[PDB]
A paper describes a structure:
In [name], [name] is the soluble periplasmic phospholipid-binding component of an ABC transport system thought to be involved in maintaining the asymmetry of the outer membrane.
Ttg2DPae adopts a mixed α + β fold with a highly twisted anti-parallel β-sheet formed by five strands and surrounded by eight α-helices. It exhibits a “decanter” shaped structure never described before for any other protein family. The structure presents a highly hydrophobic cavity between the β-sheet and the helices that spans the whole protein and has a volume of 2979 Å3 and a depth of ~25 Å. We therefore modeled inside the cavity two PG(16:0/cy17:0), as mass spectrometry (MS) experiments suggested that this lipid was one of the most abundant among those found to bind Ttg2DPae when expressed in E. coli (see below). This lack of specific recognition of the head group could explain why Ttg2DPae is able to bind different types of phospholipids.
Numbering used by the authors: 23 to 212
Write the structure that this text describes.
């Protein structure tokens, strides 16, 4: 069986080489890029675990499985809509998966990497992995010190309090949280 390090390295190599070979077709049709993303990342992403992680048990247990699913989709689709093109504009950059001692039989692990971009500007990116029945999957992403999972966890709680714990209202507006997540991170970084 593979280790979380290999699952990361393999996914990075597969996705980057796939984008490089088809960079022209994706720039012309983003729906093709979105499909390839779902095909490559889908198997290695714990979408339901991430959704529940952002909602917290306090709110997920007030939601139906059909509702949690609809929250996954708004999350996925909005992430691709506002941050999918980023994988095309700068796929010329370098990535380095840093060492790790995690074994395949482990139940949890964190895999760190570095992204050298624009003349060598390095930001760390970390992936919190969890070993499930379907193998190792991403459960959280930390970027340059910003716990993205906790960021959305806080935004979800703030929006739920404003909507008087209306899940439907929160889901119908979650696209706007994702769209602003980048500046939300920049402000929290300065
Ligand atoms: C169940 C279904 C699963 C499917 C889910 C779909 C998920 C969608 C994926 C969305 C990807 C997010 C990219 C970050 C966007 C960003 O942040 O916006 C530009 C950035 C800002 O930075 P910067 O401050 O320079 O520019 C800002 C100026 O506006 C200031 O003026 O820059 C860049 O382009 C850097 C891009 C480099 C990223 C490439 C790294 C490797 C790729 C991601 C894969 C690896 C995944 C492996 C998974 C493990 C199993
Ligand atoms: C439900 C489905 C989930 C699917 C999960 C799939 C995993 C995909 C993993 C994608 C990793 C991409 C990392 C590149 C970002 C970057 O290289 O950008 C740095 C800059 C900060 O550094 P700067 O301050 O610019 O440094 C400059 C000097 O300071 C000058 O002085 O931009 C930023 O802020 C980055 C932060 C933007 C926030 C958007 C988050 C979207 C992203 C897709 C993930 C989230 C997945 C869900 C998480 C829930 C647990």
């Amino acid at each position: 069986a593979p280790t979380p390090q290999q699952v990361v390295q393999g996914t990075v190599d597969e996705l980057l080489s796939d984008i490089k070979a088809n960079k022209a077709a994706y720039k012309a049709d983003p729906q093709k890029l979105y499909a390839t993303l779902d095909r490559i990342l889908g198997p290695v992403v714990d979408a339901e675990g991430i959704a529940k992680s952002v909602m917290t048990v306090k709110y997920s247990r007030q939601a139906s499985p059909e509702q949690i699913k609809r929250f996954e989709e708004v999350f996925k689709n909005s992430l691709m809509q506002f941050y999918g093109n980023a994988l095309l504009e700068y796929d010329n950059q370098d990535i380095r998966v840093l060492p790790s001692s995690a074994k395949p039989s482990d139940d949890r692990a964190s895999v760190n990497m570095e992204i050298r971009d624009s003349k060598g500007t390095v930001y760390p990116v970390s992936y919190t992995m969890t070993n499930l029945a379907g193998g190792w999957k991403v459960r959280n992403v930390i970027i340059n010190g910003i716990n993205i999972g906790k960021l959305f966890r806080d935004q979800f709680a703030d929006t739920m309090q404003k909507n008087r714990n209306d899940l439907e209202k929160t889901i119908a507006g979650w696209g706007e949280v994702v769209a602003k997540a980048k500046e939300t991170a920049k402000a929290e970084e300065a």
